[PDB]
């Protein structure tokens, strides 16, 4: 509940952040902490360095400890910060100045949480249970041919799903899969813990998809 953190800005887009940083000085070592939006209970570190910005994601260790994968595990992002404020250890640079939450601005917005989320899409419109690759095309070419209309259907398991969306009259299928870690993600694409997440995001930035997600194709 990083809320007591004055340089913590709730759910903020990676963009919104980079903005705050230049609007902050863009001074080497300038950093800010926001909540992650593709890893449950995790966060991301945004640090300015070399006039560029660098985003690091802080995964939550099952132990309940936090750690940017590959490095030591710290007890709280608070600590993590301090420690990286004195020890580069992997980071492009030392964490000099934090970027506190501007005047007024507030933060944007045990195990159950793990579940609920993983399977949230289950009840969401764009999600069309088990369905054929064709069952889909048609189901999506029917009605409103608005661009970016989409849905995601499962393939045989509870591990492999697919993304179907409309683009200039044609329907495009994007493979989705659950790698070793139980982390879903289109091949070569961002990685998430869930889909309401996967979507939420691809509905906000193409980030590789030929276009962004729009309106949830209707289900029978």
């Amino acid at each position: 509940s990083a809320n007591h953190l004055p340089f913590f800005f709730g759910n903020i887009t990676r963009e919104e952040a980079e903005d705050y940083l230049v609007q902050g000085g863009m001074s080497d070592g300038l950093y800010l902490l926001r909540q992650s939006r593709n890893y449950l209970g995790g966060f991301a570190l945004s640090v300015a360095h070399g006039r560029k910005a660098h985003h690091y994601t802080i995964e939550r260790e099952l132990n309940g400890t936090y750690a940017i994968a590959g490095g030591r595990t710290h007890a709280s992002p608070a600590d993590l910060c301090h420690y990286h404020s004195q020890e580069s250890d992997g980071l492009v640079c030392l964490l000099k100045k934090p970027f506190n939450r501007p005047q007024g601005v507030q933060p944007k917005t045990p195990q159950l949480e793990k579940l609920i989320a993983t399977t949230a899409h289950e009840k969401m419109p764009w999600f069309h249970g088990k369905i054929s690759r064709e069952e889909s095309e048609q189901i999506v070419l029917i009605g409103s041919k608005t661009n970016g209309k989409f849905l995601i259907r499962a393939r045989d398991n509870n591990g492999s799903y697919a993304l179907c969306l409309l683009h200039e009259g044609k329907v495009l299928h994007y493979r989705i899969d659950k790698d070793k870690t139980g982390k879903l993600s289109i091949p070569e694409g961002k990685k998430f813990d869930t889909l309401w997440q996967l979507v939420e995001h691809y509905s906000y930035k193409a980030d590789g998809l030929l276009r962004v997600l729009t309106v949830p194709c209707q289900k029978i």
């Binding site: 690091y56 493979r175 694409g189 193409a206 590789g208 998809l209 030929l210």
Partner: peptide, 18 residues
Amino acid sequence: PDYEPIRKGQRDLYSGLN
């Protein structure tokens, strides 16, 4: 039979340790 590849050139990557 054919899935859409992602256009690498367009992904906001994430920085990594070391």
